[PDB]
Amino acid sequence: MKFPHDFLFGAASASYQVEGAWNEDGKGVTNWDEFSKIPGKTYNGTNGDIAVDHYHRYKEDVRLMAEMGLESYRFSISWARILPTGDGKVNEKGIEFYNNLIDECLKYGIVPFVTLYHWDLPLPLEKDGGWTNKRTAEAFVKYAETCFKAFGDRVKHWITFNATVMFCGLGYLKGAHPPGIQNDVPKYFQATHYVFYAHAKTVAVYKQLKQYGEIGITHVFLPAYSVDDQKENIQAANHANEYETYWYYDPILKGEYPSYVVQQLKEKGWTPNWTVEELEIIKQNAEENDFIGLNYYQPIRVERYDMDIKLAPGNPSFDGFYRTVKMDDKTYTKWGWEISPEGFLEGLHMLKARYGDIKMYVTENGLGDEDPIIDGEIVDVPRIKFIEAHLKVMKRAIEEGINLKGYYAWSVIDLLSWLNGYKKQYGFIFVDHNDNLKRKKKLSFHWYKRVVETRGEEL
Ligand SMILES: C[C@@]1(C(=O)O)OC[C@H]2O[C@@H](O)[C@H](O)[C@@H](O)[C@H]2O1
């Protein structure tokens, strides 16, 4: 019984990835609904139209989570289910559905942890300029307030945004996410600003509501290490960390943007169109966050741009100052992501040094795999070893006085990986695409049950 009763063992899903029912019960079209049908954007033309069909079998999937001894389920609300056009009339049929999902989790004592925005923007709001238009931030606040009024009697754990770095960075820098834009740095940075503004304003509204649950944001956590002891490389890491960690966590946690990056955007002419009022709202609401969410999969190993010659190479950074690299002496997934428990642990240390005793939830962590199948059984031993290694570093972080209060494995069920199809499995529950999307427990499902039952006595 080592992890305290204070700490939730969970597993996670995202609405676009898991629900399907893209056109049902009054749901508005989203950006991912349109974007996924552009050839070249999703793996093998893979879709969320049906996804894994969680919308129609939510009762079954929740029964399974309960059978797994799950303590908390983290899912996302589809904004286009509540408010189809982003604003305007509320779709009651969408409110019914999330009330039913919430109520079913609750039957079995499973705690909802709810993400409001997991990348699936109602389409008009894309056409307005998405997160580059303050309007979308004001719309988001209204939506959040709608969800709070409708669901907040029962839901006491809320996430505003998920992984802003990806949706903003992939949407405006690489064109791999909607709206599909490439190398527009100013829009990227502007998008992150309006998101952080929407967050802080939403947090202020939630607290004025007097609902007595908790709220915070979920970021990607992607700690950057220097590939060696070389000063140029150390500097490349510092810079990586500034842009990938500090830009995101400082505004939410500290109430100020990191002056290092601010100085460089000014020089480059890329500073966002931000107002004093917006920055005050951010500044005054940094102290209102109850927690920080971490989606952590890997660190990155960096060398400076001109230290090739100075161990395979890496992708260059957006401003071309550094690049990430792969290395002989480390372990990678089959899609090339590093598996680094020591990476994660020092990462956690770096975060307590800067942000102090902030309450941390690991809102995503897991292994993407093409699962071994034997006699119709999914024997996903690699996933078990992945989660095991990460759970052990958490156990140690806690022993070391880090304020970690939950762990949500990425993918409670097999679902759609945005850009990797169904082939990049991440779940505890298998889904049979060849047998009418039927659910089967994997090896990992039974293992995780035991971990929760024992609260992590695994040495
Ligand atoms: C990007 C991908 C993947 O499919 O590879 O990684 C894992 C996980 O990242 C999370 O940060 C996203 O919220 C979620 O949607 C997941 O999907």
Numbering used by the authors: 1 to 310, 321 to 469
Text of the article:
In summary, we have characterized a novel PvGal-ase encoded by ORF1119 in Bacillus strain HMA207. The overall structure of ORF1119 was similar to those of other GH1 enzymes, which have a typical (β/α)8 barrel fold. The active site is located at the bottom of the pocket formed by loops of the barrel, a characteristic of most GH1 enzymes. The catalytic nucleophile (E374) and the catalytic acid/base (E163) residues of ORF1119 were conserved with other GH1 enzymes.
The complex crystal was prepared by co-crystallization using the catalytic acid/base residue mutant E163A and pNP-β-D-PvGal. The crystals belonged to space group P3221 and contained two protein molecules in the asymmetric unit. Part of the structure was disordered (residues 311–320 in chain A of the PvGal complex) and was not included in the final model (red dotted line in Fig. 6A). In the complex structure, clear electron density is observed for the PvGal ligand, apart from the methyl group in the pyruvate moiety of PvGal. Although the complex structure was obtained by co-crystallization with pNP-β-D-PvGal, electron density of the pNP moiety is not observed in the structure, probably due to slow hydrolysis of the substrate during crystal growth. The remaining activity of the catalytic acid/base residue mutant was considered to be enough for producing released PvGal during the long time scale of protein crystallization (typically 1–4 weeks in this study). The catalytic residues of ORF1119, E374 (nucleophile) and E163A (acid-base mutant) are in close proximity to the anomeric C1 and O1 atoms of PvGal, respectively. The O-2 and O-3 hydroxyl groups of PvGal are extensively recognized, forming one or more direct hydrogen bonds with the side chains of Q17, H118, N162 and W428. The carboxyl group of pyruvate forms hydrogen bonds with S427, K434 and Y436. W420 forms a stacking interaction with the sugar ring. In HoBGL, three different residues (E408, Y411 and F417) are located around the O-6 hydroxyl group, and the side chain conformation of K415 is different from that of K434 in ORF1119. These results indicate that the four residues in this region (S427, N430, K434 and Y436) of ORF1119 seem to be involved in binding to the pyruvate moiety in ORF1119.
